[PDB]
Amino acid sequence: DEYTKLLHDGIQPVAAIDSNFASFTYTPRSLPEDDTSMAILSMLQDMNFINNYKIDCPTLARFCLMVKKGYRDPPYHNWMHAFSVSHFCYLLYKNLELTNYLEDIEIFALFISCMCHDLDHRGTNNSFQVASKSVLAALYSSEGSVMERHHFAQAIAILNTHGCNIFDHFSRKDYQRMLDLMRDIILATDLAHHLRIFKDLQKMAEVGYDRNNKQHHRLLLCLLMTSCDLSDQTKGWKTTRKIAELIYKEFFSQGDLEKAMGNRPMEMMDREKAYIPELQISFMEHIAMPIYKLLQDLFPKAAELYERVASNREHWTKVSHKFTIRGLPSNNSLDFLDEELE
Ligand SMILES: Sc1ccc(Cc2ccc(Cl)cc2Cl)nn1
Ligand SMILES: [Mg+2]
Ligand code: NA
Ligand SMILES: [Zn+2]
């Protein structure tokens, strides 16, 4: 039983999970899925949020289980994505020393937002609102349908479930503050939102981060959230390769249906038009690398993250020069590439 087992698991120290658990080299997708709820509790305890906010541990256990259950099983947008995004939030706390830059409550909200940010994703994305089917239209678009309102609504539905409100003992002001933070942070996972605020993020990085500037706190939270969402690109080759398989398996299931029903899919969802290495390069150069470059500009200790993403972009570039990979094979695996690179 998940609940009894999670109650019996108490709250472990992070040293009981792995000595590298707080390292940027750690791959949280290596952790067995049955141990991830325990790891969530361990991270919250290690960041001192359980004690400092007087969180009821049974209520938190139930909350964690409800959030996990609120994910479906498409290839990419599942609980293991939310878990690995949440783990990266913890890595930023530990390695960038976020308490020196943000309030305790903003960091707590960021972590809970990471857990909840893709709730009830069904492996479909019809959000781009572009007339072209080109990947470039998608990579530049700053408007869309905002699916992220639903993810937030699912989070609030969990909090409004009897026995699951981890914040119900908060003051009315702190309760509203937490929910407003969750809304803003979850809405920030929309790439259209990121593209709307990009110029303001650049301006912040140019002038320098001001810990006394409240607009800078807002912008930084958005940047950190997107950096958590894309953190699979900051690990090694095997992670970026595996995640590309998942992203495109998910995309192609949508696109295959759209094509079958006589509709034009986005080109990145059309297995006949989607050159995966080239698409990965484009996403990394347009979206991911600039995010981690901004992060490095604000936090010199984040330099290794940018350099990992850049290294992974160069791996995909080598792949693109040696292979023409249009769509995915019938088994959805490009794992032969691991031996090709070394
Ligand atoms: S790391 C990563 C993350 C997402 C995607 C798919 C993808 C998603 C959105 C856009 Cl606008 C473009 C692409 Cl190509 N690919 N790689
Ligand atoms: Mg999302
Ligand atoms: Na996503
Ligand atoms: Zn996500």
Author numbering: 580 to 921
From the paper:
The crystals contained one monomer of PDE2A in the asymmetric unit. The structure had a good resolution of 1.5 Å and the electron density shows an unambiguous binding mode, Figure S1. The pyridazine hydrogen bonded to key amino acid Gln859 and formed a pi stacking interaction with Phe862. The new crystal structure showed a previously unseen conformational state of the protein. The H-loop (702–728) covers the ligand in the binding site in contrast to entirely open H-loop conformations typically observed in published PDE2A catalytic domain crystal structures. We call this an intermediate H-loop conformation, and show how this large-scale change of H-loop from open to intermediate states affects the calculation of binding free energies. Nevertheless, our structure of PDE2A catalytic domain solved with 5 had the H-loop folded over the binding site but allowed ligand placement for binding energy calculations. In addition, the folded H-loop contacts the bottom of H12 and could stabilize the helix.
